[PDB]
Amino acid sequence: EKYKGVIPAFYACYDKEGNISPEGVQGLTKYFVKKGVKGVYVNGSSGECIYQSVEDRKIVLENVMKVAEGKLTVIAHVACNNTKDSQELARHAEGLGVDAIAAIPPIYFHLPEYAIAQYWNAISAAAPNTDFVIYNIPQLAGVALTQNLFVEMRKNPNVIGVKNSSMPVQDIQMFKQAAGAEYIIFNGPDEQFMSGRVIGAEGAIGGTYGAMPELYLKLDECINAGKMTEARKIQYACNEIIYKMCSAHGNMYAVIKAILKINEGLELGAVREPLPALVDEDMEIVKEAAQMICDAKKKFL
Amino acid sequence: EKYKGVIPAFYACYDKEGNISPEGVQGLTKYFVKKGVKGVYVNGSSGECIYQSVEDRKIVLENVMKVAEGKLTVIAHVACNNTKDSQELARHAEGLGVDAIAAIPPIYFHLPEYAIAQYWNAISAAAPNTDFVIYNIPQLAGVALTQNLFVEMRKNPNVIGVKNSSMPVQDIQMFKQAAGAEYIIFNGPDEQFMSGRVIGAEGAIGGTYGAMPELYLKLDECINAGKMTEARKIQYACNEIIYKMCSAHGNMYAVIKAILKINEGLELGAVREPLPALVDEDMEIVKEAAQMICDAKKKFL
């Protein structure tokens, strides 16, 4: 129940020198508490985790935990390129009393299911009294979570479910059907939020949620109320905002941090290289998207 | 409105000699009229169109039209490997007073968008007073319908919409949003029926619908009524039946024709080679699926 609803992915908050900002993180966590979201997914790829050091990630979760404790549920993504660094973040995260721990599969190399199962179980062993969520992200990490690797992962009692980042909503259905009522599948594709929710995803973690959290909460209220016409209107509004945010030269998360600077006065810094920075030409796209968010809120809330 | 709802794909009906059965087609069309489905999608890939001659396909539509006229809406899939053969089926289909005409993209070779646009427009020109539905089937025909090829196709006024066979429900959303209220997107993936319907597909054409039409009609009644829990229960029941039907050595359509022989006494013949025939070992799978259909009907209807 504590994992059901809208859990935005937590962005990377930098200072003007390109280093993790404790004030920025505490600031962005106060924003999510204020917006009334269910939880926060920390140090995921939307949090620029691929580009952070082990110490950078410890500082983010530490500062999220100063603000978020009995108000938001926190999922801490702890996977690293190494099993060793991943175990260190898993220990650390359990040390700060986190709700769940998450892990993408091993990266760059396409390892067998036994190595993937060993990687995830080794991370789960480093935080043995906390919930664990596995992934299905074939498009970035290579291959999709099979039902055989998932059966193997359900042998670990800490596994509470899957973050389904693949595009077929059938994957959600198949994992939910195979796992049953004691597991949860989180909808990954923000653009298919309503579709992944109706077919079986009781959870939803997304990288665009932070830009317009009230829209996803309203969309979720319509889904739970069963008004699919009002839900479909909000989904379409969210999707055109995403497509506008993706039309910039600069990275989507650079666009989102500039939207939050306009709409909320939050200073989250820039995006870490190699993510492309915003250019002068993107500011009109950044202003247009920020206004589309304000307009959607007035129309649907 | 005449295209909205459940439109099953019409199966290939053979005699015991492996030739098209007029009695079998008329028989299977009386079955769909009786079950109260919105329409019938004739000579699509579920109708073994890849394996039929031009004359075989004319005989099927002729016999569907003897039974179906003012009771079912009929979409006739007329694409062939050639533009020439495709135009012949398009003429013929307009000759028999068909509702719409459909066409997969060119096959085997990956042709440019201009050749695909020319192929589809040439077929549309051969039946110039009938509705035309284009495809998005990247997984079989090679590449996905782009928004640029779709913009080009909307210049033809006979184009009423798209049959979306790709897996992302985002594709439905994007095509519906780009096209607007004067176009329809038909949900292709049977396993995501409820998800593709809520996000924007007002139509639904599927190859498994014929095996359990009352389940898809009930599922659609729940979707239209907004009861997503009862819809999700029917979707899961349909999906486990599909997964059982796909677990046979013989082809799914061979399994379905044997299920319809058990549950309805319909004799639709076998599947045309190279489609794999059922083996002795598949009969227990065929009996188990037929019983799962009977059980689903009693539970949800």
Added chain:
Amino acid sequence: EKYKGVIPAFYACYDKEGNISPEGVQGLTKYFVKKGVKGVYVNGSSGECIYQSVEDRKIVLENVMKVAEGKLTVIAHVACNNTKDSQELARHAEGLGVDAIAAIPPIYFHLPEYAIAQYWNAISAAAPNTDFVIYNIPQLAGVALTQNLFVEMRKNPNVIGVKNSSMPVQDIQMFKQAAGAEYIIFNGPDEQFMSGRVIGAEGAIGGTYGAMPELYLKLDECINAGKMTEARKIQYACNEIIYKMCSAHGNMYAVIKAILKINEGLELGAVREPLPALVDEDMEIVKEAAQMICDAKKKFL
């Protein structure tokens, strides 16, 4: 030995009405005999086989056989969408005394290996005293020829080898190593001719060979002589000609038939729709490629 060397794919020869030209076929076969190539691969995809009727294909092979008998070795590609039509071409081709028969896998649907093995064996049974060539063309027909399927097909004694259309030259190496000296692997990718020939392909069948057969014969003479610098110079010359021929709006085979009209006075007609026709703007590309062929011949022969 009769299959070793340069075997160009035989083009579709039409009259001005878009129907198969007996005079055109006999004409194009006299061209290949004159150029001293090892054989001719008839009714393959470069021969527009996907777009020909069963009777169209019988007329082509009949007319190739009037000219080619004891001078060229003939491989007749007999696969059709159906097993039935494929068997008819296999019978017919054996009736005319061809050297080998070839077959792409089943297309559009992704069938299991047993259905593919049954399709190919059924075609091989229709011509039981003639050599049979299987394919590996993952990029068009879906999935690559696995070693398992290849082991299964080596149980049929008529199987003489594989036409390798995939891009990895490792595939040639792996099939040659697994099969041994009693089988032949034909190099498919014209642009990697020299690379597939050195790693194990003793055969070579290509769609661009007909445009400049003397260049591939010279390239092969260098490969057999072990002069890799002169071979690499010819390969690069052939590859820039191919890239120029592919830069047209009209299909490559439309470009090639127009080059053969300029350089040889051969009238092979146009390309069958949906293959895109040449436009006025392509004639400069067609003239430039024809001159690059003339220039390559003078430089390397």
Added chain:
Amino acid sequence: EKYKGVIPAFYACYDKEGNISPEGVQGLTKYFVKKGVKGVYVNGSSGECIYQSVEDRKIVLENVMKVAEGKLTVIAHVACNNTKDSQELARHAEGLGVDAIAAIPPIYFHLPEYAIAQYWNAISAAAPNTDFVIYNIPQLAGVALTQNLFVEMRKNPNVIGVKNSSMPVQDIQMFKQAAGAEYIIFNGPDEQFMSGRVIGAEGAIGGTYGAMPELYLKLDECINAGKMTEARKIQYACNEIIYKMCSAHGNMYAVIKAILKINEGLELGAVREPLPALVDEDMEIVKEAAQMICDAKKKFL
């Protein structure tokens, strides 16, 4: 000329505690000097670079440079998940006087060509008086090096060429043809060594070279001498050894470190997790491969 020939990828040398072994690195570098290879490719993916910290990689190159100076040419792979960490390794490597610096594209996220060009140019700027090698590795890093991106990177005068890890040998041909005589393309796929070397790769960097360097040097001597039959015999021998090394449960590099322990008495440690360790059942595969290497050497040297 200093980059032409056999450049093995340098393995990760650990102590029994799983930390970088200075003695192990110096030891493995003395091995390559002794075997008479052209150079050594340090901290590439075969060097477990994805799993090393910035300080781990500095220690490896430092210890390679104590042994290798005027005897081997050194290519130091400096890419990291961050641009920042990558620049640090680029500075460091230039500080130790390496011949060239190499960089895979940005990983996990699929960034635009401008971000990839910026990432590589930023790394090249951190070592501005040293040669730079770009990659084409679509299978692991997502998308292939386009000609457009390659044209952009040739604007940087430090770019000396491409390490081609894709499977089509046409890619080598196309990059060599476009770039000309002032650039070099290194053959990536060890299994296609002879095929990439004949079509235009004057360089060759591989992960299996370290297990049998004398075989690749002999294979290269045959290629340069133009004896394609003796080259093809060595290629086939190398390829069956690779396929045996890949048949283990444990990772290929774990297999190779155990082969070097048997055949050379080198102690390179194990593979860093998540790379799967060898199991008891793999020792027979490890012994069989080591013997196949000894047998190949006696047959071809």
